[PDB]
């Protein structure tokens, strides 16, 4: 089969900048049989470009494609807010049909440090035998961030989960919520609960903490 490799994984650019997205094939593909799709969160993929360089119906002029042999590009000449999405290339010349792994185009803005907040478990939850400790990292950029949970100075690993919001439509930042989960028994055996946050915008790690009780 023909394997399609897209690069970069993530493209970070400001509105008005030119986006150049790459799709490399494991062997030569006729330009007639290379397509690009756009996908927004919670939406089906939409055809953008077909035959390497032709715009699909309804697609604005700022989208273009070029390439042949093993190397293809999708170009967005000047990015609009609505263009920030995931893009997939696809070949349909030789079966089986294959897709690239996708490139996310996200908004580059000025680096912004997270505001950090820690929340102890509720007394109601403790009654049930489990303790959830929550750390919020609010309104930061870029997306990459590190949460390090500490319990009486012991670095925790493997007992936490986190998720991140979609890039904010107004300020282009992200927020992150992390939950440390431990048994009520473990929670009551220890005193100091700390969330240490590392991020590009912080000169040094920020730690928020509480003492149990």
């Amino acid at each position: 089969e023909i394997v399609l490799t897209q690069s970069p994984g993530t493209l970070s650019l400001s509105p008005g900048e030119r986006a150049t997205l790459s799709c490399r094939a494991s062997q030569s593909v006729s330009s007639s049989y290379l397509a690009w799709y756009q996908q927004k969160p919670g939406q089906a993929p939409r055809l953008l470009i077909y035959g390497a360089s032709s715009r699909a119906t309804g697609i604005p002029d700022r989208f273009s494609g070029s390439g042949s042999g093993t190397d293809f590009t999708l170009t967005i000449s000047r990015l609009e807010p609505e263009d920030f999405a995931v893009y997939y290339c696809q070949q349909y010349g030789s079966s089986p049909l294959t897709f690239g792994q996708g490139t996310k185009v996200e908004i580059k803005r000025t680096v912004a440090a997270p505001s950090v907040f820690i929340f102890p478990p509720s007394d109601e939850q403790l009654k049930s035998g489990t303790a959830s400790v929550v750390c919020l990292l609010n309104n930061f950029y870029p997306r990459e961030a590190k949460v390090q949970w500490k319990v009486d100075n012991a670095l925790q690993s493997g007992n936490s989960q986190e998720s991140v919001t979609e890039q904010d439509s107004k300020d282009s930042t992200y927020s992150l919520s992390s939950t440390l989960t431990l048994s009520k028994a473990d929670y009551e055996k220890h005193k100091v609960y700390a969330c240490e946050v590392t991020h590009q915008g912080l000169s040094s790690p920020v730690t928020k903490s509480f003492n149990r009780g």
């Binding site: 089969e1 007639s32 049989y33 397509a35 799709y37 089906a44 993929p45 939409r46 055809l47 077909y50 035959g51 699909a56 997939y88 696809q90 349909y92 010349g93 079966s95 089986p96 049909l97 294959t98 897709f99 690239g100 792994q101 996708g102 505001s115 907040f117 929340f119 102890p120 478990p121 509720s122 109601e124 939850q125 049930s128 959830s132 929550v134 919020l136 609010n138 989960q161 986190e162 998720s163 991140v164 919001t165 927020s175 919520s177 939950t179 989960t181 509480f210």
Partner: protein
């Protein structure tokens, strides 16, 4: 206009059978091939196979050959994708699409969730505030997705972040919703998160204040 309309979201247990559907309208259904595409959570697009509804000529992607059955009923302009015995690893969004060579029209997708977990309503715990303050709710131990969360019955929207759920080892989901507010408001303004989990008919209002 050309439309492909897929059947609704499915929540299943491992070992159960399932046939999902894709109905075409606004064109000659028996004149075009229909493809099926898988998209696992947070992952890319995968080609599954293709069918010509006119004669049911069917080709499978090598990875899906013998794993699913693709079929069609031309009399009702419908294409199908089916599993005899679902696995948790079949959890994904499934798209049908009309084949031109490229895929020019797409269905809206059918979400298929496969888990050994059973329907369960959430517990809602406060994330209590202790000059910008943050407060919130922890919506813990529910199945399946989704939940809805509002603040003050929709009156509070500014500074709200409702996070994607995480799937715990228990097979149950956990989600947080937070809001940042003036520290000065903490003594005077009531903050209530309104949580609804339709699958279990569990609706909860949690007032959140300093402990």
């Amino acid at each position: 206009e050309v439309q492909l309309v897929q059947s609704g979201a499915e929540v299943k247990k491992p070992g159960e059978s399932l046939k999902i559907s894709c109905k075409g309208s606004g064109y000659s259904f028996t004149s075009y091939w229909i493809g099926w595409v898988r998209q696992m959570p947070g992952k890319g697009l995968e080609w599954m196979g293709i069918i010509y509804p006119g004669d049911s000529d069917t080709r499978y992607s090598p990875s899906f050959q013998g794993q699913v059955t693709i079929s069609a009923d031309k009399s009702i302009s419908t294409a199908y994708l089916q599993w005899s015995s679902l696995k948790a690893s079949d959890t994904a969004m499934y798209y049908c699409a009309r084949y031109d060579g490229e895929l020019d029209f797409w269905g809206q997708g059918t979400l298929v969730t496969v888990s050994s977990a059973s329907t369960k309503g959430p517990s809602v715990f406060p994330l209590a505030p202790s000059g910008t303050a943050a407060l919130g709710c922890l919506v813990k131990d529910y199945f399946p997705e989704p939940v809805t969360v509002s603040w003050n019955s929709g009156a509070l929207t500014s500074g709200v972040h409702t996070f994607p759920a995480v799937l715990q080892s228990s097979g149950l989901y956990s989600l947080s919703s937070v809001v940042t507010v003036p520290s000065s408001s903490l003594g005077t303004q009531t903050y209530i998160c309104n949580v609804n989990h339709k699958p279990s008919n569990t609706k909860v209002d949690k007032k959140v204040e300093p402990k």
